[PDB]
Amino acid sequence: SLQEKLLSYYRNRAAIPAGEQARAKQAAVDICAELRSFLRAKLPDMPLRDMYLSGSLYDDLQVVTADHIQLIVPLVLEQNLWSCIPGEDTIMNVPGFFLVRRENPEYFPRGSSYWDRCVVGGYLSPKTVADTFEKVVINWPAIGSLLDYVIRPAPPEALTLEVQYEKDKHLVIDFLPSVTLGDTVLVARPHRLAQYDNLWRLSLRPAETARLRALDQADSGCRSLCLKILKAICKSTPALGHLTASQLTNVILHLAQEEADWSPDMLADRFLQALRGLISYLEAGVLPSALNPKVNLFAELTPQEIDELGYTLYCSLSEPEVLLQT
Amino acid sequence: SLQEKLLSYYRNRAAIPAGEQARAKQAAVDICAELRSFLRAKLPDMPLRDMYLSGSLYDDLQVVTADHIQLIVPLVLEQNLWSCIPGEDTIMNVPGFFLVRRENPEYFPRGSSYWDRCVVGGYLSPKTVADTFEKVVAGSINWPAIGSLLDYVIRPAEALTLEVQYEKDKHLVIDFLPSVTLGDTVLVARPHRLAQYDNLWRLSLRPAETARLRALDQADSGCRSLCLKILKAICKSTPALGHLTASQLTNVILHLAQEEADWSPDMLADRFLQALRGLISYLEAGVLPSALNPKVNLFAELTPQEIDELGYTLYCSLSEPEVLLQ
Secondary structure (H helix, E strand, O other): OHHHHHHHHHHHHHOOOHHHHHHHHHHHHHHHHHHHHHHHHHOOOOOEOOOEEEOOOOOOOOOOOOOEEEEEEEEOOOHHHEEEEEHHHOOOOOOOEEEEEEOOOOOOOOOOOHHHHHEEOOEEOHHHHHHHHHHHOOOHHHHHHHHOOEEEEOOOOOOEEEEEEEOOEEEEEEEEEEEEEOOEEEEOOOOOOHHHOOOEEEOOHHHHHHHHHHHHHHHOOOHHHHHHHHHHHHHHOHHHOOOOHHHHHHHHHHHHHHOOOOOHHHHHHHHHHHHHHHHHHHHHOOOEOOOOOOOEOOOOOOHHHHHHHHHHHHHHOOOHHHOOOO | OHHHHHHHHHHHHHOOOHHHHHHHHHHHHHHHHHHHHHHHHHOOOOOEOOOEEEOHHHHOOOOOOOOEEEEEEEEOOOOOOEEEEEHHHOOOOOOOEEEEEEOOOOOOOOOOOHHHHHEEOOEEOHHHHHHHHHHHOHHHOOHHHHHHHHOOEEEEOOOOEEEEEEEOOEEEEEEEEEEEEEOOEEEEOOOOOOHHHOOOEEEOOHHHHHHHHHHHHHHHOOOHHHHHHHHHHHHHHOHHHOOOOHHHHHHHHHHHHHHOOOOOHHHHHHHHHHHHHHHHHHHHHOOOEOOOOOOOEOOOOOOHHHHHHHHHHHHHHHOOHHHHOO
16 A cells, blocks of 8 residues: 555656656757757857756656756866866865866966856856856847747846746756866855855766666666655655755665665565665765765755754654655 | 759759658767767867757758768867968968967967967967867767667768768768867868968858858748759769859859849749859859958869869850750
8 A cells, every 4th residue: 555655646746747748858958959059159269068958857857847957058177277176175075065276377377268267266166157157148039939938037046047838837947057077077056055155066966867767777677766756755845845856866876776676566665765764864964975975965954954854754654644645 | 944944953853852851960960969978978178169060951952962961070269379360361372261370379388278289380280180189089989889879870981071871872971070260250170172271271151151041032032042952953963063062152142142133933044044154254264252251262272174174064054054954
């Protein structure tokens, strides 16, 4: 009956109608295709690659409603002029984040690189880049009419588009600057606290979802289904609002290294293990990344909030119709 | 009628069948998409924007068969470290071509740009840039892996060119074309036919000419592009006329379009006759001015024998143009 409860909860709350999901993503795909050709002509100065889609909607892991997706804005930084410094090596002492430093100004003076205009204190400021990308940025009415969409950028949060693709269907697109030095991929979404605002955030998302997709392909497994049910519960339960998709994804990755068997009838059991696992990580104040275990995925939560989450989850064990209500 | 013969020739010879056209473009788009992923994953620090598709196949100006497209390779050049010098202001006096000069070498020493490695005698060499792309990028691509991945037979052919088999008996030729944008000026690494002018980049005329061709036809539903495509199909089909380029033929039409306002469907046979007559006059004069850049002689790379073959061939058909229409 937990199985049946879980599959009912998925079909009735976690699942997005197949057409809504397809259309929402296609609208994102259309807008991306059009910006690429547009920005091509207009920005001959900027070391940027083409913007590209990212997020659960793109990878079929969005739940409840298809309402949001990112446009990654990938800067180009040359190796001999920049380095990334992991946060645990900075005085910030926070793994999972990075400082981006302008190297060798003696060899290659300031102004050699376009992004020198975005340097603060010798570091590439994630916020100065975001503001720079924003100020430079496009005829949205023109692009809208070309696709028969209604696209309306937001007032400050000006790096988000509101996209009316169907009559009463909208989705949100936000731009996300990004950088790659070596194998390390970074993203301009600020640490929650202002004093960490010069740090870029390590992005784990593409390797995490590829890991999870590859596992499920190899044996027709139910890891992704379990994830989405978990995402849907947290998304629909305001006391669980602080939990993020990346935390839930890594709960499932640890359990996958513990459990080889994820056949459909294992769903109920795997979900219980994930739920008890989340509770345990919450008790330890630490949820390490399965891909990069030095990273504590609870790093931005306060101990109080961490306490509140475990408490909510502990209560839910004896009131199961408050995780599973629709 | 000559009118009937032209209209029928377009449908029977010039127009590419729908299926062949869609498969060729799909193959192009698949490959461009796959290369954007490879550049992201493997060369994220290379000062290039993303490669993108370009040419008549993209602009629906290709004829007879879809056998060719370009992947533009856009260098990122710092606007404060580089300038372009029009060929006619050089000792070489070669309009339609530019030198790309390294600026401020006292303050920003060699190395400050990645592209300094391609500077010869103070100028960014198009050949050295092409050499750099070929071994850093093109030579790092696993073409069999992409082939099995996309399900095409792909074969590198002559230095920067792919052959992609998209049907049993049809292949698409993709050539990589290094390009530079300085301010409003787009330059392309397509060498002047003569070796002594080989440090010169070629001014990119195609996008502006095409945009002008299309805008004119859009305003009155005219037969300019139809006429052009008929002319391209003739030259492509006729060995003695293979020396003409689509840029030359488009400029004949642009010059004709300035003399003639009426290009209704019934006017096709007249305009076509006027375009042949014009071609002859330009070839006799040894000059075909670019419509958008009047200092540039689009016949400047034709040899004497070549111009003599074109002129004689076209004159012979003036008495019976039908002989061109198969």
